[PDB]
Structure formats: structure tokens, C-alpha cells
């Protein structure tokens, strides 16, 4: 939608991303909202970063790709904050979220497959 939201995931990739976001929510490995996502980036614990490409105005999450780039963390734009908030499993719209690092989870293979797909999409 918004042409400043560059890597915009499609139907299949967005379906994979929202499934792994749902699994990460039910494992409680997921930090929601743009401020908590920025905090995870500053601490250095994010596996990867999901944003919503239709937040108005867009800049309030455009601040995040800079830190994601400078710290080598994958980011992607799914196209709806309402659907992203329902995937994260909270009664609000959520414009950004982060899957955090813990190498003892039971969803690690899914997280690494989606993270590899996002790395390919940014590359």
C-alpha cells in the first residue's frame, strides 16, 4: 500500500509469518508494539521483526528498519495491522512485533525457516 513500506510480503509468505507469530505468541516468545520491538533491538535479542504496512502515519514504525539494518536482523512488512494484532492474539491493532531469541523452543525450526525466507526476500 504505502510505497515507503518496501519489503511487502505476499499471501504465502504472510501466511507462514502469521502462523509462526501465532505459535510464538502461544509460547510467549513474542514482544508486541513498536516500543517493545525497539527495546528488543537495543538489547540484541530479536530473531526477527514484523511490521504492518498500513499504519498511518508510516514513520512511527519507519524508525525500525534502520536499527534492523545496522544490527543485521531481518525485517518484513505484512500488509494489515488488524490481522497482525489478531495473530499476536490481543484485542488491539498491533503495528509491529518481534520474535525473540531462545534456542530451546519447540518452534525453532519454523522460526528459522521463516527467517531464512525473509533473508532471501531482503537479499
Amino acid at each position: 500500500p504505502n510505497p515507503k513500506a518496501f519489503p511487502l510480503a505476499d499471501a504465502a509468505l504472510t501466511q507462514q509469518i502469521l502462523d509462526v507469530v501465532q505459535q510464538a505468541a502461544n509460547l510467549r516468545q513474542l514482544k508486541k508494539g513498536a516500543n517493545e520491538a525497539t527495546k528488543t533491538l537495543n538489547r540484541g535479542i530479536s530473531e526477527f521483526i514484523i511490521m504492518a504496512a498500513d499504519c498511518e502515519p508510516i514513520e512511527i514504525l519507519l524508525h525500525l528498519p534502520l536499527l534492523c539494518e545496522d544490527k543485521n536482523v531481518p525485517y518484513v512488512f505484512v500488509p494489515s495491522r488488524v490481522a497482525l494484532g489478531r495473530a499476536c492474539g490481543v484485542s488491539r491493532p498491533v503495528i509491529a512485533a518481534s520474535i525473540t531469541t531462545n534456542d530451546a523452543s519447540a518452534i525453532k525450526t519454523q522460526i528459522y525457516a521463516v527467517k531464512d525466507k525473509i533473508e532471501t526476500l531482503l537479499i
Binding site: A11, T14, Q15, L18, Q22, S80, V82, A83, L84, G85, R86, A87, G89, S91
Partner: protein, 178 residues
């Protein structure tokens, strides 16, 4: 003396297909539900349908409401008379009273109440007045014997509602308006 039937089918992502069956399977249209991350039930209601069904060809009507209930508990709700014209529509409402997976939707034979009911937890049924799209507040109360609701059936004529649960005990109520 002529009608034509349409099949609506919903993906887990929220993409909705509408084929017609009179001429062969050919997609009339596609659109997308707003939000709808994992969508588990769709229902149409307010006219004739496979629950409150027709009895002669002249008594077939066209449905007005189309409700889409998802895994997170959210129930989007659409007006067909605007959705068919907008072709990627905005819901009339988005109900969020329940919190578990929506496992039953059931319109009245008229289409004035929408009964949405989960399956994953006890006491998880809510009735909705339409077109107000507002949840009724005085029933069910906290002492209503609902159980884990797995079946809901509205009556076509007498205004009954029948709810069946996991313990194996259906339970009748009669709405006094009808």
C-alpha cells in the same frame, strides 16, 4: 420459477471465493476479509439457507448478512447489499466478546439475531441483535447451564433455540418475541 445457487468458500487466510453452481464451477468473484488471520467459520443468513430452508421455489429469498468468525474469537460481519458492490468490503461490525475459537454461527430464520458460540470453553455463547450489531446483555447470565456448547439450532417456526453441550444434554429456550 427460477433461482440460482452460489457457493462461498473461505481459506484460512481470509480470502473468499464465490462460485455459482447453475453454470458450472466458475468463480464469480473473489475478495478478502479485513483482518481475519485464521478464519474458521463463515455463515450466510437473513434469507433462506441450509438451516432455515425453503419449502417451495417461490419462497426463496436472498441473504442479507454474511458473518465470518475466526480462530482468535473475532467475528466480522458484512452486509451483502454493499459487499457485492464494494468487492473488497469493510465489515458492518467486528464483534469481540468471546475470546476462544468461534466454532458455531447461526442466524435466526429472519436474520434478526446472530448466535455465535465457541467450543473450547464453558459458557461461551452470545446472541447479537442485528442490524444494531450489539450483544444482548441479560442472557446468558452467570447461572445459565450451557456447558461446552457444541451444537446450536434455531427453530424455523416456533422461535425456539436449542443448545447441546459436551455432557450430552440439549437444552431448550423459547424466545417470546416470535
Amino acid at each position: 420459477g427460477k433461482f440460482r445457487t452460489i457457493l462461498i468458500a473461505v481459506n484460512a487466510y481470509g480470502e473468499v471465493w464465490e462460485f455459482d453452481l447453475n453454470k458450472n464451477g466458475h468463480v464469480i468473484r473473489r475478495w478478502k476479509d479485513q483482518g481475519g488471520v485464521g478464519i474458521t467459520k463463515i455463515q450466510v443468513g437473513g434469507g433462506t439457507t441450509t438451516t432455515c430452508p425453503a419449502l417451495q421455489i417461490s419462497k426463496i429469498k436472498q441473504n442479507r448478512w454474511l458473518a465470518v468468525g475466526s480462530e482468535s474469537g473475532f467475528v466480522n460481519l458484512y452486509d451483502r447489499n454493499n459487499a457485492m458492490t464494494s468487492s473488497t468490503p469493510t465489515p458492518v461490525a467486528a464483534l469481540d466478546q468471546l475470546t476462544t475459537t468461534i466454532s458455531n454461527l447461526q442466524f435466526s430464520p429472519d436474520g434478526q439475531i446472530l448466535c455465535m458460540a465457541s467450543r473450547a470453553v464453558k459458557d461461551a455463547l452470545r446472541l447479537v441483535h442485528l442490524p444494531s450489531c450489539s450483544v444482548f446483555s441479560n442472557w446468558p447470565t452467570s447461572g445459565t447451564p450451557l456447558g461446552k456448547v457444541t451444537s446450536v439450532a434455531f427453530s424455523p417456526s416456533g422461535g425456539l433455540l436449542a443448545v447441546g453441550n459436551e455432557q450430552g444434554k440439549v437444552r431448550l429456550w423459547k424466545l417470546n418475541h416470535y
